[PDB]
Symmetry: D2
Subunit: 354 residues, 4 copies
């Protein structure tokens, strides 16, 4: 493993609809985005079937729910520009056609929802800097001009809200270390300078908030194990030391907070099966990795259902989408075995960063 | 203080719009509902001014945001039936006229949002039982028939979601004790039997969730001090003992979780000023009560702004609405002094339960 | 229940020998101190049998282990002066005769071990002030002169070390409130002024340290329920609000930290049986009281064995000493039923404070 | 760094006397054990001066306080047998001459105090197995015969009590992994089988208990960073995954629990200065390493004074003993700079394990 490697990513993007039904977005062999959704917001629900958005795309799709409940998808087009399309009403399967946001992007798009209800998109630009564009009014198809935040990115960006509403963005830099930059006031265009968090990383960063309000960042390290760092104060400049966990992982990690408020991390393990680790107590030590039966061909994508149950999506060896879930809304629940969401095969359309 | 007393309630109901701007609803001297809203989602924002909904009402209004971002208000009419009106689009100040939901109600209405996106309303009925009615599809003006959950209520009901999506409802019973009843599966019409939590209470119950997922209930006790009880397991049947805190309070309490994940409680104190107490550590002991200058004439109503800052609304001695807020997004922030939201005077339209 | 009442106390004092065998001290119908000890440091051990110290006493005996492992007992004599006697070697049943420390005392004695190895005794004096006397060298029969700390005491004193080695003393004052006073530097004769913790109490105070280093104080309140308060900072002046727990208790409480670091409290309940409550999580909420079968005639005295198992001693209706213990070294262990430590009957020799 | 390396150890062993004065034991250029002690139990106390025990030794000395307060030192002699000598009374500077315990030992000795007051010594034997010998009565010069616990050791052993009084012993095995073995009942000669904790380690293991009762083990790993693992249940068989902390260390670590109950770790860092890291919250994340000025030539040895203040001892470049300490009994206290405990120079007499 080399310092500039980027671990295998998830094969779909997932979102909860306004009524919390899960909906997945991926790219098929026709290079178009397809999507599928639960018919009811429970993991054992039937799925509607795969439906196509017309248009050829050249990145992994990113999806986020607007503050009025409508899903909106962002993707790079054949012109290397940003395109988006949206549900025309919450919980409806009527969509716009792809609409242009222009620009020139060289990474997958990352979408955040500001705490004033406005979507904001972060991408690597043609000059390898971080660029962003935002809705100028909440849940409205009115966007700003493109603006640069500088820097030099060698991974996809990952964005998350701090507890006080300030967006913070994480990305690997030219030295293969994790860097970050943040709004200095909530949902405004006033930003810090770039700062290094020092450690080399070999995956995109994955960010989650704990109960205490503080951000935690997970990534694969140079020795191919999971490592993590967390905010220790009230601001974006006070961080812990990095810690690693034993166990070689072969994909990006995926993190989720269970309904007991504890963190869980999923990743493809050294034997190409799905591995899971969880915090055993508040802030506590981490469990040994547990493995699920079955070889997988992507990183996991993890979501929560309306009753709190965790559900995991992966690419199978047959190049189709599989999933499994918790049988009960309990931290020690047993899990189902992999089930197929059949109808199309999927490709990894992630932008090749080099 | 007698066992059947119900402490003074808050004078307004508050909600966050889809873009997180606060909006308050109260009843004026014309017995109509009026509302006012922030023009931007920050506590130092200007307010738009008081606007009237036509129609005479006979209860405190209850407000909740739909899963598509539209606010919806519920109130008892002059016919003792339930009426509602809604924003016709998220973050817009265009409303329906009051529309009928019928029934016969003898308490203030309480509204909950199920985790599948459907609003559900709980009221005491003409037979003193708990009744409820729900949207049959998420964020849609299609409602069920009225259905009884039984029991005998001597307070307004308070409802909250468990971490697994099950609604749980709390209300004082015929013996002046706190009782509760819960969905046995998330967002379904399958309910438990009524169970007593034993302690006498002299206010409506106030329910909040902690980070661990568990519900905590606050109420005034028979000796006029604050008392509280919390779930200790994974279900609705395992509760702690009751604990009281020293200090006589003269209103219902209001509880909020700050951005550090700790709980804070506000109440009118024995000297008729606003009092505040907070948890000093995770699950920790509670601080001595702190007082704010100024005599108040209602219980506090507490809300959070888009940047996490807590804001408190009270009725002043001039019968107008006043508010104060935290100066910074920090747990140890200083507070502003009371400021007026002028333009109308307010009355307490709470249903007299005896 | 009146504000000046002092709840029933424990009938024996207990200590661990240098090898951790438990040894109990009580007063029999001959007004002499008798003692009995485990033959091995396990709760199911046989006991040696009751042995008498010659001499008539007029208070409950207090016992503490010296820093060289020798037990030492303190008691008021027929002359109202303080007397003491000691093991002449650790884990040996050879004792000195009662030896005089003079003074004039009007409460039971309370003994503390300073963190520099010197015993220090606290008593109410003939002028109702707090007085103390100390070893001038660790584990040596060389004592200081008597010195007054002032104040007005209406309970027995309770002393405990802070985490930094400063002794802090708690006692009810003339206004029936809990007061305290503390060393301002570890194991030195430099003391603070008296300060009130405000709440009325109707038992002696009981003090324990939690894992965080902080002191917690338990007492019965004016409504005959358990109440407690805890340090919230790094010093002796920052305390939480008082909290009460529901449930009427009819004796002083006894507190212990179990081997999981959680606190447990035992007391005689409203039905004259032994009641137990425990913290369900770190700093967490408290369980409902659980009852053990059997009417008891004293407060419990609680100790821990060499394997961590909790053991409880009480006076039975037959005026003899009974005990029960945990069956395993686990927080959720079951308990044995009461067993007799037969051979003498015991009287409550506690000094009548009025 | 190779898998079989054993990091540099501390240059002295330290103990608290019965009155909590610190006393240090090391080996000088004459191959004899010398010791020095505080004259009062405070870090700014003067020290008595270096005093010699007659006799040539061939290991680092181990010291433990007996349950009657007397210090006792264990060391390998020129005959490769175990020898010991003891204070003849607590807090006295009168010692026995070295007395024989025989055996054949190939590591430094490790001493534990059972919870029934009996010392027990663990050593690697001439067959590379773990051997032990124990006092047959508490604080008495009567010892058992030597007994083997089997295994194959490639480090010195480290022993610690579990919260329930069971001794647990940790040592590196033939595969360079950390192994452990434990008493299955407190202070009895009934032991488990050896079990692997799997990770390679390149230092002796260092064991400490947290507040929750659970053991935590620290060691240097194969990549020369600090790693740690902790018990997650009520027994000796349930452990967390291993975690590493960033930062190359060049000595064994030393761990201590501060008076707030949080853990701190000291080690020589990659630049040969003393480094310190601490837990920022309960169980929490670990701080970045902080450095103290001054090149050091051993691992640190860490102790606590009677007022809770941490004190650290190291070998200086002048081959003399230096120390520094906290200025106040507070977790965020500043520290003094290195001060000399002059009078002799010290050598590292640690047994060469290969």
């Amino acid at each position: 493993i080399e310092n500039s490697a980027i671990a295998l990513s998830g094969i779909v993007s997932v979102a909860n609809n306004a009524d919390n039904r899960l909906e997945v977005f991926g790219v098929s062999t026709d290079s178009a985005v397809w999507h599928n959704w639960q018919t009811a917001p429970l993991p054992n629900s039937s799925w509607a079937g795969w439906n196509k958005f017309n248009g050829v795309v050249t990145s992994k799709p990113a999806v986020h729910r607007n503050s009025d409940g409508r899903l909106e998808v962002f993707v790079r087009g054949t012109d290397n520009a940003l395109w988006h399309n949206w549900q025309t009403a919450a919980d409806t399967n009527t969509w716009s056609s792809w609409q242009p946001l222009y620009g020139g992007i060289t990474s997958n798009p990352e979408v955040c929802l500001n705490s004033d209800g406005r979507l904001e998109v972060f991408v690597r630009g043609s000059d390898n800097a971080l660029w962003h564009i935002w809705q100028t009014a909440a849940h409205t198809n009115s966007w700003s001009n493109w603006k640069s935040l500088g820097g030099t990115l060698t991974s996809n960006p990952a964005a998350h809200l701090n507890a006080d509403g300030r967006i913070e963005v994480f990305a690997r830099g030219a030295d293969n270390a994790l860097w970050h930059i943040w709004q200095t006031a909530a949902h405004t265009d006033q930003w810090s300078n770039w700062q290094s968090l020092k450690s080399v990383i070999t995956s995109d960063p994955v960010v989650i908030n704990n109960c205490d309000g503080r951000l935690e960042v997970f990534a694969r390290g140079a020795d191919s194990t999971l490592r993590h760092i967390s905010q220790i104060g009230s601001d974006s400049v006070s961080w812990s030391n990095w810690q690693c966990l034993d166990g070689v992982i072969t994909s990006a990690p995926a993190a989720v907070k269970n309904i007991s408020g504890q963190l869980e991390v999923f990743a493809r393990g050294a034997d190409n099966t799905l591995w899971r680790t969880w915090q055993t107590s508040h802030n506590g030590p981490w469990s040994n990795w547990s493995s699920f039966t079955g070889i997988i061909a992507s990183a996991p994508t993890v979501a929560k259902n309306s009753d709190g149950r965790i559900e995991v999506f992966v690419l199978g060896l047959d190049k189709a989408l599989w999933h499994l879930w918790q049988t009960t809304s309990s931290t020690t629940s047993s899990w189902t075995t992999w089930a197929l969401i059949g109808g199309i095969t999927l490709i990894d359309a992630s932008v090749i960063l080099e």
